[PDB]
Design a protein around this ligand. Structure first.
Ligand SMILES: O=S(=O)(O)c1cccc2cccc(Nc3ccccc3)c12
Ligand SMILES: c1coc(CNc2ncnc3nc[nH]c23)c1
Length: 159
């Protein structure tokens, strides 16, 4: 079945710029700005649109070695990005995939709000735990804050 988890978080970076950096250029930025969270990002196949597969490797000592993510949809107009965790890490005989949707909306103060859904597609009679979802949220927030710091410090990047 499907377990749905949702969260909202804020950023001080404007929506379009955050989308360009944090979403569209995560392959470059995450290992650069958060090497203690993400060791590398490998493009396995595809040119960045729907169907693109990336292998995200974690540092030594982390719970999982890697995950392979698949880009599902990229909406450059509405700052929407959908992708799925499709192999590695928690994926296996209890979990088929994790389907994620991110939408970034502008705020009047010149920042943004990120609205995130994660849908866990399980196999058989297994349940998703608070701690698994929490670990994913912590990671997402860590990457967000690292990218945000970089973008504050590098004003000519991603305009
Ligand atoms: O989806 S993620 O791509 O890891 C993600 C991406 C970007 C920012 C995120 C911020 C908070 C939580 C996330 N994950 C999350 C995990 C569980 C429930 C709700 C959100 C974030
Ligand atoms: C939320 C947290 O990180 C992202 C960037 N999305 C993303 N990053 C790196 N590889 C991906 N492959 C599919 N989606 C990917 C969105």
């Amino acid at each position: 079945g499907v377990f749905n988890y949702e969260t909202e978080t804020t950023s001080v970076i404007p929506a379009a710029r955050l989308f360009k950096a944090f979403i569209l250029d995560g392959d470059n930025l995450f290992p650069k700005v958060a090497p203690q969270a993400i060791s590398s990002v490998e493009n396995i196949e595809g040119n960045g649109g729907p169907g693109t597969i990336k292998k995200i490797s974690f540092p030594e000592g982390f719970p999982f070695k890697y995950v392979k993510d698949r880009v599902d949809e990229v909406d450059h107009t509405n700052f929407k990005y959908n992708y799925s965790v499709i192999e590695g890490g928690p994926i296996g005989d209890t979990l088929e995939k994790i389907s994620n949707e991110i939408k970034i909306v502008a705020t009047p103060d010149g920042g943004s709000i990120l609205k995130i859904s994660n849908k866990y597609h399980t196999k058989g009679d297994h349940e998703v735990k608070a701690e698994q979802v929490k670990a994913s949220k912590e990671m997402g927030e860590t990457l967000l804050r690292a990218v945000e710091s970089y973008l504050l410090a590098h004003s000519d990047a991603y305009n």
